[PDB]
Design an enzyme around this catalytic site. Structure first.
Site, mmCIF file in Angstrom:
data_model
loop_
_atom_site.group_PDB
_atom_site.id
_atom_site.type_symbol
_atom_site.label_atom_id
_atom_site.label_comp_id
_atom_site.label_asym_id
_atom_site.label_seq_id
_atom_site.Cartn_x
_atom_site.Cartn_y
_atom_site.Cartn_z
ATOM 1 C CG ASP A 13 -1.850 1.242 1.283
ATOM 2 O OD1 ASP A 13 -1.609 2.098 2.165
ATOM 3 O OD2 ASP A 13 -2.750 1.390 0.429
ATOM 4 N NE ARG A 27 26.137 9.552 26.333
ATOM 5 C CZ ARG A 27 26.688 10.279 25.348
ATOM 6 N NH1 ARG A 27 26.644 11.606 25.374
ATOM 7 N NH2 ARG A 27 27.242 9.658 24.313
ATOM 8 C CG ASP A 32 35.986 9.191 22.360
ATOM 9 O OD1 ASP A 32 37.102 9.605 21.965
ATOM 10 O OD2 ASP A 32 34.933 9.804 22.106
ATOM 11 C CB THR A 33 35.706 5.064 18.275
ATOM 12 O OG1 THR A 33 36.067 4.982 16.881
ATOM 13 C CG2 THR A 33 34.676 3.969 18.612
ATOM 14 C CD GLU A 35 34.044 9.051 10.897
ATOM 15 O OE1 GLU A 35 34.662 10.127 11.092
ATOM 16 O OE2 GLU A 35 34.502 8.148 10.168
ATOM 17 N NE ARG A 79 -43.624 29.924 27.228
ATOM 18 C CZ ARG A 79 -43.872 28.863 26.438
ATOM 19 N NH1 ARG A 79 -43.512 28.864 25.159
ATOM 20 N NH2 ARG A 79 -44.461 27.785 26.945
#
Lengths: 132, 624, 624
Positions: A13, A27, A32-33, A35, A79
């Site tokens: 669809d 965390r 650390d790297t 990318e 009324r």
């Protein structure tokens, strides 16, 4: 398994990229790297379809919010008096007592009876005699 | 001769009914195994509490568990000098294994007896398995150090009841006399008991001694000889440890009885000296999403027990890990708040984080079938991985397993690794089709195009896969090909359209005029093109959702943008438009036309101008 | 308030932009209106301060405004002997019309600076109008009781900036010196200015004198001639007031420049001295749905201004009625508290509301045009009327206008009295229908049953109507009736639902079990309710959007909340659910259930999570 090509493709669809979550958890994992950020997109092909039948449906109306027209007007007079202040004296629920709404309906009755009898009398007459 | 003719066993849900599957174990002796496993955790509690009160030894320093056996009455008597059990640890636990109402969390509030699932994971296994071969299990325990007269008698023959009575036992620890059934004489034969004990007792630090009784004329010498290696599995040589002794030690330290898929026994010295021994369960724990632990590592400091199920040594992302950690450098006075707050335990759990990485990556390359079991139990957990650490997301993406078009199964058997092997020549782009529902992934038309050209596709059909998608834009220097749009690249190439020819378009021209003037200015334009698909109506867009995201686009009129009113395109040949074309009657002509309109809008917005316009026409053509 | 950091350009039409356009007025001299308007209200604020301390007159018993003109320098100086304007009353007022950052109510909290738009409504018009005829506007005020040394200086050439400083002005009151543009010497002519004075000041209470000086050789004669009658419109003869004076005085006290629909100038004299003057606006004020005030009347006590925006004399029922009431009966030292609680002020509000009744009921017959304009702007709030006072319910129902199937217009013109004439033979019941949107509800063709029967049904697409109707159960003897639905769902007690009771529920219990396991956690809970109806299923709600707008209703998970997962209740009796129960096939079973799910979900959300799936279902089942 793998169906000849590879892909067990099925019905179709439209398509959307799923998303709802992005801020979550804390965390703490590996190192650390940083990318892995480089996406891509593209589309240039269209294929045929094999869906053509006609079944039957079971007729019935549908409820929801309802408003519309007819074509009709006429008026009155009598009324007229006003004094209130929005507070909470007549702030409460009720609505309706009893009503009709007897527009149209299809009633289906069913009932059967045969039954029979026979009974008859007979006519028994008397003999007569006369003389000179 | 036997003749295994036919089989068939399918049972799921509720822990207890799953326990009964491997209760038998094809061994029966699993009872003696698990019984002494509780005597090991009793010895653990003792040596911890001895740091707060050495009076528990009662002078007697010999911590051991002794198995004596009798043929006459037919009774196997296992007696440890551990902490034993108090009146509490018997009534408030063995009573909650019998009839009380623990259910799964608790009968009443669903909170009070919440912490009995952990306790059934250990003691509950040995309970039923004992009664498999035992006619009666008599537990006569006494808490070490604590008063002898508060000793507890416990009796059951396997019913949902317990005969508890306070007795006196000057002996500390637990003394369990299992009246075995007549025929279960094997567990009362010396040679058999030797093999049975050793099989598990070697993983146990606590010396498991046996009644070596010599019943000779005058010389009825009762001696207790240890059948176990009598050394803690983490501190003994890995060479002496076989693979099963690991698998069996798991069942103790995890408060479980399942077979772990893999493990990692590494010792690390330096500033932070510890000996780590982690495992990977073959089961998803009940309490996986509960606020209580069923994951965790048993804390030992310098071969002494402090606390069990301590998740403080493992990140929440690595909650799938089960085992223990013996830190010889960590304080012995350490507590759970020290473990949560102090930096030494933060660096320690990060030092354990890498032991997880090696163990998973190995299992992945070694046995992807066991890693598939792991992944279908703990997938959601590891899905947090690439979504937190995007830096090493490539490394975690090797661990990531997705469902693909390679099969029509929901099994996540295909990896990004598997796909690297599946890659076509020139293919720098891994094709993705994403959805928060499996049936919505299967609602994709783009699949038929991949099917024709012969290139492979990931069917992302999970809840938290969309969170990783915020970061997982590239893997292995290779970008992903998102099916985000269909585009006007096929503009004047729209000839391959079955038989939607100019013959139809001559009959479309009156239909076009009627529809454009029926809808009017609530739509930008109604163009009749030849899109095939199962969709009878689909729209064309200029920019970001036509014009629902930019500056100039909203500077057109402000209110929703006039341009944003999508270009209403239909398939002349598709039976929905064809049945709409068969109906010239205005009431039902507008029924079909405005249905197909808000259908196409629903595809390119998810929200409608009038939901009830659509839902009237939609449900009406379904019903009437 | 300490704002800053708010960078967000998105403002158009809302008050200030609409002001500037019609502040031109094609008139120019509209500046002179607003100057004297500010001078009248200033002298009237000094009358209020005088009640609080007579010494604030500064020795001046005669308070009036004195226009003067320098033809050569091209400067027109309008200086009143009013209160003037206090230092903060210059800065947080004129400065907020030039450069500050008020946003609408306040950029920070959205409350503190909400009385900026009250000042922009009058002085913001006067600002723009001034700079149309003036090159430069130099304001020199000095407030009442504040020493000449605390005189205030404000200066702007029409830029997005101003110059505020402290000067010495020995005169108390306000001095507006407009340096006229080169060529605009029209408003330096004495005869011109005096004609423009009379034209506006005639309907203003404050005496407006002009500088009549004879500056001939050596002869510096100085005199001041009042062009104005120096009497209040309300206190002056009703027949002496012309229509144009009412219309333009409306614009004064309304802080506006549009024409009023109608008015009523009255005085009540004898036991209770009060002059009343009410106006009906043509356009709904911005504060209509906002928490700060422009609704109500201006309070005057014996031609002395006390307070503006006094909604104490007028309920929310008539909040739109803007004008003023002066009383020589009520105390000069009257408090905002006394205005709410006092019986004398209750008799004020009671007589005023009844006087607006006399105005509205007249206006229906006087100009149905202006009354229809009135009801479509103001009737939304007026609709609280009956549903606050049951005593006058019938008499408020005489003022109530709704929509009906008389015409497919959303213009709510038709009254209940109309419907009473419009009732048919045996049509005792007032058929009504409430809705979320007119366009939404109008798309429903089910009402064609009432079309052919020839019944008319009340179209209700208001917000507060659904509450008001709860008491509007009967009018003129005719009881109201919901045709929303009625059937066998209750018939006798519960189970009289064709025959969908326990026998059905034997098949419905494993059905519920399957569905909840199929969806997993997608839905909160799935039930089979025996509401027969002509709809297949319905989703139920706890609060707004189920739970997508409240404290606990977000504090459950934190994502889109487990509560927000709608309660899916189907009718097992309905033919589509008969066919869904008839389906044993896995994929089609789930497809039927999930069809009715996303059907009802789309009816309550107007939005689907994964649209393509639900669309593919209707496409397949209708293409077949």
């Amino acid at each position: 398994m793998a169906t000849s090509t590879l892909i067990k493709a099925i019905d179709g669809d439209t398509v959307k990229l799923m998303y709802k979550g992005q801020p979550m958890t804390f965390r703490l994992l590996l190192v650390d790297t940083p990318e892995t950020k480089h996406p891509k997109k593209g589309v240039e092909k269209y294929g045929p379809e094999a869906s053509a039948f006609t079944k039957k449906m079971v007729e019935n109306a549908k409820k929801i919010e309802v408003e519309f027209d007819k074509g009709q007007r006429t008026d009155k007079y009598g009324r007229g008096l006003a004094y209130i202040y929005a507070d909470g004296k007549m702030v409460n629920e009720a609505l309706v007592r009893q009503g009709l709404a007897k527009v149209a309906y299809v009633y289906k009755p069913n009932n059967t009876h045969e039954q029979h009898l026979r009974k008859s009398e007979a006519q028994a007459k008397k003999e007569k005699l006369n003389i000179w | 001769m036997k003749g295994q003719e036919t089989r068939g066993f399918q049972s799921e849900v509720k822990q207890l009914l799953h326990l009964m599957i491997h209760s038998l174990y094809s061994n029966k002796e699993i009872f003696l195994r698990e019984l002494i496993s509780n005597a090991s955790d009793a010895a653990d509690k003792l040596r911890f509490r001895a740091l707060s009160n050495p009076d528990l030894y009662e002078g007697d320093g010999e911590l051991r568990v002794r198995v004596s056996f009798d043929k006459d009455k037919r009774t196997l008597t296992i007696s440890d000098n551990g902490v034993g059990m108090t009146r509490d640890e018997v009534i408030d636990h063995l009573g909650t294994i019998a009839k009380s109402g623990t259910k799964s969390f608790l009968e009443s509030l669903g909170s009070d007896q919440a912490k009995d699932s952990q306790l059934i994971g250990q003691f509950g296994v040995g309970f039923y398995s004992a009664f498999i071969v035992a006619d009666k299990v008599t537990v006569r325990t006494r808490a070490a150090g604590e008063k002898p007269e508060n000793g507890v008698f416990w009796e059951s023959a396997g019913e949902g009841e317990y005969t508890v009575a306070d007795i006196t036992k000057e002996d500390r620890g637990t003394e369990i006399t299992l009246h075995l059934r007549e025929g279960e004489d094997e567990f009362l034969d010396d040679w058999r008991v030797r093999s049975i004990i050793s099989k598990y007792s070697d993983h146990i630090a606590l010396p498991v001694e046996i009644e070596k009784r010599e019943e000779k004329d005058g010389e009825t010498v009762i001696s207790w000889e240890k059948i176990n290696k009598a050394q803690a599995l983490w501190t003994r040589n890995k060479s002496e440890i076989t693979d099963e002794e690991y698998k069996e030690f798991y069942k103790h330290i995890a408060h479980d009885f399942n077979d772990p898929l893999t493990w990692s026994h590494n010792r690390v010295e330096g500033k932070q000296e510890y000996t780590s021994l982690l495992y990977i369960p073959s089961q998803a724990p009940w309490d996986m999403w509960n606020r209580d632990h069923k994951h965790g590592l048993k804390l030992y400091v310098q071969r002494v027990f402090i606390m069990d199920d301590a998740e403080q040594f493992m990140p929440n992302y690595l909650r799938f890990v089960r085992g223990l950690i013996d830190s010889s450098d960590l304080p012995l006075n350490v507590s759970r708040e020290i473990l949560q707050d102090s930096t030494v335990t933060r660096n320690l759990r990060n030092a354990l984080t890498k032991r997880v990485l090696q163990m998973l990556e190995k299992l992945a390359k070694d046995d992807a079938e066991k890693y598939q079991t792991f992944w279908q139990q703990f997938g959601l957990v590891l899905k947090e991985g690439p979504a937190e650490d995007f830096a090493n997301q490539e490394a975690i993406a090797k661990l990531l397993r997705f469902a693909s078009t390679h099969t029509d199964s929901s099994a996540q058997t295909v990896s990004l690794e598997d796909y690297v092997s599946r890659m076509k020549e020139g293919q720098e782009k891994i094709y993705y089709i994403t959805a928060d529902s499996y049936a919505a992934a299967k609602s994709s038309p783009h699949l038929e195009l991949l099917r024709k050209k012969g290139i492979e596709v990931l069917l992302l059909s999970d809840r938290i896969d969309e969170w990783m998608m915020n970061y997982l834009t590239e893997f292995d220097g290779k970008p992903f090909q998102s099916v985000s749009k269909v585009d006007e690249s096929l503009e004047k190439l729209a000839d391959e359209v079955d038989e939607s020819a100019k013959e139809a378009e001559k009959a479309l021209t009156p239909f076009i005029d009627r529809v454009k003037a029926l809808l009017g200015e609530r739509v930008k334009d109604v163009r009749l093109t030849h899109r095939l698909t199962d969709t009878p109506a689909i729209v064309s867009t200029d920019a970001d959702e036509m014009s629902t995201q930019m500056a100039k686009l909203f500077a057109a009129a402000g209110q929703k943008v006039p341009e944003v009113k999508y270009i209403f395109e239909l398939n002349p040949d598709h039976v929905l438009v064809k049945r709409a074309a068969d109906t010239e009657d205005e009431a039902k002509f507008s029924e079909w036309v405005e249905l197909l309109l808000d259908q196409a809008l629903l595809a390119e917005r998810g929200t409608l101008e009038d939901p009830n316009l659509f839902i009237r026409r939609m449900n009406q053509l379904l019903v009437s």
